[PDB]
Amino acid sequence: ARGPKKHLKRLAAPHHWLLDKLSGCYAPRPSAGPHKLRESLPLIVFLRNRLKYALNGREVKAILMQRHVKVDGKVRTDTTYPAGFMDVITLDATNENFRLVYDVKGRFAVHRITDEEASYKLGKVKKVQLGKKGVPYVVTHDGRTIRYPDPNIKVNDTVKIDLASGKITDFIKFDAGKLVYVTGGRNLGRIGTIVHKERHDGGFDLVHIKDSLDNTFVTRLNNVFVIGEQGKPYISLPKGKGIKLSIAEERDRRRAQQ
Amino acid sequence: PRAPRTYSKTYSTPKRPYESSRLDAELKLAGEFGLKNKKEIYRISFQLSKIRRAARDLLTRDEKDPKRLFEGNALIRRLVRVGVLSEDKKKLDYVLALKVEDFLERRLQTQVYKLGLAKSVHHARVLITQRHIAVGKQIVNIPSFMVRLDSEKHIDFAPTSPFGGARPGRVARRNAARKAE
Amino acid sequence: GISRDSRHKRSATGAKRAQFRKKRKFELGRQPANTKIGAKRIHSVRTRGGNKKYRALRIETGNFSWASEGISKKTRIAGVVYHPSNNELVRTNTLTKAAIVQIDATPFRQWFEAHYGQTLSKNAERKWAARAASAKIESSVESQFSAGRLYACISSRPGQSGRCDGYILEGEELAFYLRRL
Amino acid sequence: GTYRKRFNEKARSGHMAKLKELKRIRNKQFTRSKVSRLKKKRLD
RNA sequence: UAUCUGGUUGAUCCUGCCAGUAGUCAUAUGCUUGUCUCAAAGAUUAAGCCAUGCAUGUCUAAGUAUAAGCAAUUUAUACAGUGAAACUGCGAAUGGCUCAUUAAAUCAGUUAUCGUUUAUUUGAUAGUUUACAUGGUAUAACUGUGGUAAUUCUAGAGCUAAUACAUGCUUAAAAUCUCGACCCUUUGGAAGAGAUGUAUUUAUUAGAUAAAAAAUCAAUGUCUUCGGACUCUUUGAUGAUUCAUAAUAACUUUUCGAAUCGCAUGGCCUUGUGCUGGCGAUGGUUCAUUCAAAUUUCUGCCCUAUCAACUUUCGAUGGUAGGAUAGUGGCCUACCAUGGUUUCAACGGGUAACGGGGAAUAAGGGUUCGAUUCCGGAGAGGGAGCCUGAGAAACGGCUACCACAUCCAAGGAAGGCAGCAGGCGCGCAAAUUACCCAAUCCUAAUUCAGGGAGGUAGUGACAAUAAAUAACGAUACAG
RNA sequence: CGGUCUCCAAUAGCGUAUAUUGUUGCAGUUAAAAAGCUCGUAGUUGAACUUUGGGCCCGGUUAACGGGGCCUUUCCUUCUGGCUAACCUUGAGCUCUUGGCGAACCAGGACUUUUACUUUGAAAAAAUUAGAGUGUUCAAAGCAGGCGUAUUGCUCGAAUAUAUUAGCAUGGAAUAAUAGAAUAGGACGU
RNA sequence: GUCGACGUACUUCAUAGGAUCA
Ligand SMILES: [Mg+2]
Ligand SMILES: [Mg+2]
Ligand SMILES: [Mg+2]
Ligand SMILES: [Mg+2]
Ligand SMILES: [Mg+2]
Ligand SMILES: [Mg+2]
Ligand SMILES: [Mg+2]
Ligand SMILES: [Mg+2]
Ligand SMILES: [Mg+2]
Ligand SMILES: [Mg+2]
Ligand SMILES: [Mg+2]
Ligand SMILES: [Mg+2]
Ligand SMILES: [Mg+2]
Ligand SMILES: [Mg+2]
Ligand SMILES: [Mg+2]
Ligand SMILES: [Mg+2]
Ligand SMILES: [Mg+2]
Ligand SMILES: [Mg+2]
Ligand SMILES: [Mg+2]
Ligand SMILES: [Mg+2]
Ligand SMILES: [Mg+2]
Ligand SMILES: [Mg+2]
Ligand SMILES: [Mg+2]
Ligand SMILES: [Mg+2]
Ligand SMILES: [Mg+2]
Ligand SMILES: [Mg+2]
Ligand SMILES: [Mg+2]
């Protein structure tokens, strides 16, 4: 190619979107934004294929141009805006608030939250550095640059950000025993507690996580997201609380409830 | 371009079509069940071969294997639901004991014949293809329709059919009008 | 015409590679800007991205820094005296980085006289007395100062930034280049 | 594939030129019709 | 091969043998072709040539309308609704198509940028430099006069705008550092005059630390109980940096720091068209992020040894310096050494060689196929070179050459279907020059316009699913 | 001379033509193929030996099977830091509490033979393959859907496995290599 | 030139043996 691409084939789209393979030939390409293309849920998919409020892309555009949708407290009018992990989506007309958190299966879930919980979000500190004029700042996983951070905040920590002011209200250090959420790999969507961080210089650090059922799994440090102390997450968790269940157990539960 | 839509062959030619014993077996099957051609018999044989190969492969797995348990239970549940496998024979060994006749008996043609709605398998086929047979509230015109155990008790003449309480067909009212005139 | 591709070269084993593709813009080159002493002529060059490169086609003054005294002054460039890469740049008076040049010594002499009150109000005398301990300098620099032309080395790239900045030679570097001269 | 016969060599003369150059570089180590041939042989 | 059939003599058995019978897939072709669902369309290694039409344009309240445009009007004597043309901005570098070249090249998995560019999105970020607001150093559309056979050809003259072009001010305090009038010879002091944000270039400095105590030389600052005393004294990240950041001295055909636009009319009063003030749009420096790009580490390709030595004169391997690039690098230049690959197959040759995910067969090992729905690469008849732009060595952009080829008044002008339809390539053959942006998504100034991308329908049984052409009786005749 | 038939095969499908090597695991006297003989480089291959056995404890599966600890001449070394067990002791009732001592464990710096092999975990896009659920009227398929309903509505899914080699992390220490102390230029030290 | 050698593609000749019976 001679420049950036602008089209996305349906078969090439992220699997977790759960798009019909025969509905069309193209899928919404997420516009540039806070979250990476493959880790993001464009607003069209959320409003149409998840909430079912809109029956087609044109109706999604009609909804957005009415300014009814806010992402992290700010109105967005782009159909393919890349909403992503820990993003608060507010619909005032419906009096509804959502937080985009993976379910255990590895797909963004329709998780409703309260207004108080919609006032803040969490962000993994991806970088900490001095800017111009010697003003320290932290860069989080959604591209937010926050100046004058608490000096104790280091990389891999999780900062609680207030959406109204975009200021750090609280922070959580990365340490053993902390409650974490897996945001990548085949263990995506699971919740557990750190046991041990294996450090390899010049390579990828691995973290061993123990879930509530005592199962243990190893994941790269890039996919880990601290969300609180054990049993006391800073956010309301989805149904199932991030616990993986074997196919037989899922069958048993499904038959029991049916 | 749009994504491909999957397709598959529901039958296969047997290894030696010309075996005299095989020819006689196909003749008996077609005559007993009123099958149109050898394609239907090949289709049922292909399904049965697939089922039995799956069962054999599961049996090769060690007992208590999660894959064996899950897949074998699903397969036995399906076979019991369609009626091929009896309730008391819920094991993979009895899945290998199935025969084409078991599947053929479940066809809506044979069931319509057996329930007393038709005087022969061919009369049952004609009744089905002419939209006289309803499984529940749904008219079914496919002789190869495989009747489930629950569906077995709901086969009846369709509400729209002349035999099911609707008005007489075209011939009946035609002759009645000509007699009246 | 000029390209920085590695494909056109032979492989490490000595194989003659074939042409994989046509020449690409992102691996281009441009004609050298043989900067020369004279009335300033500089023309911009539009590079990859929106960035701009300045081409010193001619330049006759430069910001030269006296490192020992920690100063820098704008001075005229007398001429190129020695170049390590090739001698023809010396012959043609071509300014490029690492070229040994001669610069007018007047501003440095004036600054040193003002600062130390020496040669090569109460406040002025006080300040000169305070700085009297540092008055002494290397003999080699002072001989040049008597001559009127100081040896300097260009540390800028005139064909890229458009500047002819540099620094006066001192110590071991000056001794080495005087030996080479 | 490099020096295979083309349908219309005249229409791509420049291409042919490149090939020749390549040969001259590749085979530099070595250099350092039926009726027509038979006619020459019989004439000799 | 197996199974089955037949022959092996005067006949019948038992061996053996012989001949025919197996297979899906592929190509070509013949006969037949009623219904429902569904779906594809290559091939002369000819990436051979193309008549005709279409396939890329785009305007919101929010850049520029005295169209001598439309309609509304005294909501509007600066304009005010809608709005052709043109300027301005963006896109046209995506999509679609084909597989020619390409044998450590592409590509697959896996690495790196502490080796670089990045329009756009997202978050931060700029009190340091006539203003109740500057010019033509200026033109388009337009008016009017014209040339040419001809083209998306254009010449002279007259007008007039901007988020075009070019200029250029306005806003707190403090601190620090220089140069220092003068008084005074002190342990000296000091009016004042300057400088400071950012961007570029160069030079120098800081960016600490495995843990504890003293004596003096020089400069020299806070303090008391005038004797000596003097504590908490500032420093981030990486596995690692000359890193982030900061400081000093200057340098610059040298940048940026809002002369822009929409809606609304709130608060103070000393009652002035005075002061102040809301929600948005568009620009703008730098950093980070996102979309990307470039280069890159390790391992992995079919046949060939009757291809054994190859590379090095004209860069081959490496060093120093420079040039060039966004940047590393023999990428190129100058000077140097003589290196680098190879029987563990280099180099050369062949390829009906784009690579992979995948397809078929098979009990398993294997063998073959993959132009072809997704990913990546390369090309737009063949070589070569460029303008613009964040991004192109672009071809539905430009210039030359080679081959073809259209118009011509013979002076000149215009070309690229391996895009969608449709033709030629034979004298022998095969989808419609169809409808639409309603869905999918993409482009724009943008909900609205555009989209042969894509969908819809039509059209040789491509490949697949289901499935009609009769069912129930009586009579008659015959073995 | 005049004069103007039966059966078999498939079935909305059927016919015709061309085409369609042994690693596991081949053979070499007499019917393919052992070179006239020897030497010899690359390549492939290459004798045995170095911690074996014994005595206890803990917790798992279905008396067998496997997994950990100690002891047995068998513990990596060193420094620093963090926490602190147990041990001594005072006092108040095995539990708190005074004051010493601070093992184990954890973090970091130095110190360090290298691989082959195999186990486990990440990675290996989607589509495709296998495969769970689902009366598309059946099916090929698709990822749908399902349950109440006068009224306003509730709700389950879009599973799971496979993927060679190379790279990364990890447990093993059998088999096969590799290095070490011989002119001691060797190890250790309060 | 109904030429030689080689390469390639084909054609062809070598199948009956034992037991019983006449
Ligand atoms: Mg790293
Ligand atoms: Mg009817
Ligand atoms: Mg025909
Ligand atoms: Mg018919
Ligand atoms: Mg019909
Ligand atoms: Mg108007
Ligand atoms: Mg323009
Ligand atoms: Mg080759
Ligand atoms: Mg390679
Ligand atoms: Mg844009
Ligand atoms: Mg911005
Ligand atoms: Mg004019
Ligand atoms: Mg260099
Ligand atoms: Mg050279
Ligand atoms: Mg191939
Ligand atoms: Mg090819
Ligand atoms: Mg392919
Ligand atoms: Mg190209
Ligand atoms: Mg062509
Ligand atoms: Mg081109
Ligand atoms: Mg074209
Ligand atoms: Mg194009
Ligand atoms: Mg076409
Ligand atoms: Mg605008
Ligand atoms: Mg040897
Ligand atoms: Mg051995
Ligand atoms: Mg592996």
HEC string of chain C equals: CCECCCCCCCCCCCCCCCCCCCCCHHHECCCCCCCECCCCEEEEEECCCCCEEEEEEECCEEEEEECCCCEEEEEEEEEEEECCCCCHHHHCCECCCCCEEEEECHHHHHHHHHHHCCCCCHHHHHHHHHCHHHCCCCHHHHHHHHHCEEEEEECCCHHHHCCCCEEECCHHHHHHHHHHC
Domain count, chain C: 3
Residue tagged 């501003």 (tokens): C107
List CB contacts (< 8 A) between A251 and chain B: 70
Task: Give the strand pairing for A69-71 and A74-75.
Answer: antiparallel
Q: Would you say A209 and A219 are in contact if contact means Cβ atoms under 8 Å apart?
A: yes
Task: Classify A58 as helix, strand or coil.
Answer: helix
Closest CA to C18 of C4, C27, C2, C7: C7
Question: Which residues fall within 8 angstroms of residue B171, CB to CB, at 6 or more apart?
Answer: none
> Sheet of B133-135: strands edge to edge?
B138-139, B133-135, B155-157
Q: Which CATH number fits domain A1-116: 3.40.1010.10, 3.10.290.10, 3.90.1510.10, 3.30.365.10?
A: 3.10.290.10
Q: Would you say C61 and C121 are in contact if contact means Cβ atoms under 8 Å apart?
A: no
Q: Which amino acid is at C11?
A: S
Half-sphere exposure of A153 (CA within 13 A, CB side): 25
Residues C71 and C39 in one domain: yes
End-to-end CA distance of chain A: 52
Q: How far is CA A249 from the centre of its chain?
A: 27
Specify if B9 maps to a domain. Answer: no
- B55 membership: H or E segment, kind and range: helix B38-60
Task: Classify B156 as helix, strand or coil.
Answer: strand
Question: Which residues fall within 8 angstroms of residue D29, CB to CB, at 6 or more apart?
Answer: none
> Rounded to an integer, what distance in angstroms lies between the CA atom of residue A3 and that of residue C25?
13
Q: How many C-beta atoms lie closer than 10 Å to residue C101's C-beta? A: 24
Question: Which residues fall within 8 angstroms of residue B94, CB to CB, at 6 or more apart?
Answer: B85
Residues C5 and C82 in one domain: no
Q: Would you say C42 and C52 are in contact if contact means Cβ atoms under 8 Å apart?
A: no
Neighbour-count burial of B141, counting CB atoms closer than 10 A to its CB (0-12 exposed, 13-18 middle, 19+ buried): middle
Sign of the CA dihedral with A12 first, then A18, A21, and A26 last = negative
> Rounded to an integer, what distance in angstroms lies between the CA atom of residue B90 and that of residue B85?
7
Task: Give the strand pairing for A158-162 and A120-130.
Answer: antiparallel
What backbone torsions phi and psi does residue A58 show, to the nearest 5 degrees?
Answer: -65, -40
Distance A157 CA to ligand 1 centre (A): 19
Q: Do A248 and B66 touch (CB under 8 A)?
A: yes
Domain count, chain B: 1
Specify if B12 maps to a domain. Answer: no
Tell me the C-alpha to C-alpha distance, in Å, between residue C66 and each of B70, C101, C168. 84, 14, 6
Question: Whole domain around residue C81: which residue ranges?
Answer: 31-105+149-181
Q: Would you state the structure tokens that stand for residue B107, as one six-digit string?
A: 């066809």
- Which of B3, B69, B70 lies at the smallest CB-CB distance from A21? B3
Q: Which CATH number fits domain A121-171: 1.10.10.350, 3.40.50.10710, 2.40.50.740, 1.10.3720.10?
A: 2.40.50.740
Burial of A194-218, coded b for 16+ CB within 10 Å and e otherwise, reads beeeeeeeeeeeebbbbbeeeeebe
Q: Which amino acid is at B169?
A: G
Q: Do A22 and B1 touch (CB under 8 A)?
A: no
Closest CA to A197 of A208, A187, A213: A208
> Rounded to an integer, what distance in angstroms lies between the CA atom of residue A18 and that of residue A35?
19
Q: What is the CATH number of the domain that holds C118?
A: 1.10.168.20
A248 touches chain B (CB under 8 A): yes
> Rounded to an integer, what distance in angstroms lies between the CA atom of residue C66 and that of residue C81?
19
Q: Would you say A26 and A33 are in contact if contact means Cβ atoms under 8 Å apart?
A: no
Q: How far is CA A14 from the centre of its chain?
A: 15
Question: Whole domain around residue B55: which residue ranges?
Answer: 17-181
Q: Would you say A30 and A82 are in contact if contact means Cβ atoms under 8 Å apart?
A: yes
Closest CA to C98 of C169, C38, C172: C169
> Rounded to an integer, what distance in angstroms lies between the CA atom of residue B13 and that of residue B28?
18
Adjacent-strand bridge partners of C166: C64, C154
Sign of the CA dihedral with C82 first, then C87, C91, and C95 last = negative
Closest CA to A175 of A231, A229, A123: A229
Task: Classify A52 as helix, strand or coil.
Answer: coil
Say what the resolution is, in angstroms: 3.2
Question: Which residues fall within 8 angstroms of residue A61, CB to CB, at 6 or more apart?
Answer: A79
C13 touches chain D (CB under 8 A): no
Adjacent-strand bridge partners of A219: A207
Residues C94 and C160 in one domain: yes
Q: How many C-beta atoms lie closer than 10 Å to residue C167's C-beta? A: 16
> Rounded to an integer, what distance in angstroms lies between the CA atom of residue D35 and that of residue A245?
83
Question: Which residues fall within 8 angstroms of residue A67, CB to CB, at 6 or more apart?
Answer: A75, A77
- A123 membership: H or E segment, kind and range: strand A120-130
Question: Top-level CATH class of A174-244?
Answer: mainly beta
Residues C74 and C140 in one domain: no
> Rounded to an integer, what distance in angstroms lies between the CA atom of residue C131 and that of residue A176?
60
Task: Give the strand pairing for B138-139 and B155-157.
Answer: unpaired
Residues C24 and C48 in one domain: no
Q: Would you say A37 and A30 are in contact if contact means Cβ atoms under 8 Å apart?
A: yes
Half-sphere exposure of A144 (CA within 13 A, CB side): 25
Residues C124 and C158 in one domain: no
Q: Between chain A and chain B, how many beta carbons pairs sit less than 8 Å apart?
A: 17
Does A15 contact strand F, using a CB cutoff of 7 Å?
Answer: yes
Residues C35 and C92 in one domain: yes
Q: Would you state the structure tokens that stand for residue C119, as one six-digit string?
A: 């040669």
Residues C12 and C100 in one domain: no
Tell me the C-alpha to C-alpha distance, in Å, between residue B140 and each of A238, B79, B127, B146, B169. 44, 22, 10, 11, 19
Q: Would you say A87 and A38 are in contact if contact means Cβ atoms under 8 Å apart?
A: no
Task: Classify A9 as helix, strand or coil.
Answer: strand
* In chain A, domain spans: 1-116, 121-171, 174-244
Q: Would you state the structure tokens that stand for residue C53, as one six-digit string?
A: 């490169």
Report CA Rg, chain B. Answer: 21
List bases, strand E, within 7 Å of protein CB: 2-3, 21, 23-24, 38-40, 45-46, 48-49, 92-97, 100-106, 111-112, 117-125, 179-186, 188-190, 197-204, 236-239, 244-246, 248-254, 286-296, 309-312, 315-317, 320-335, 340-341, 346-354, 373-386, 388-395, 401-404, 438-443, 447-448, 453-455, 463-473
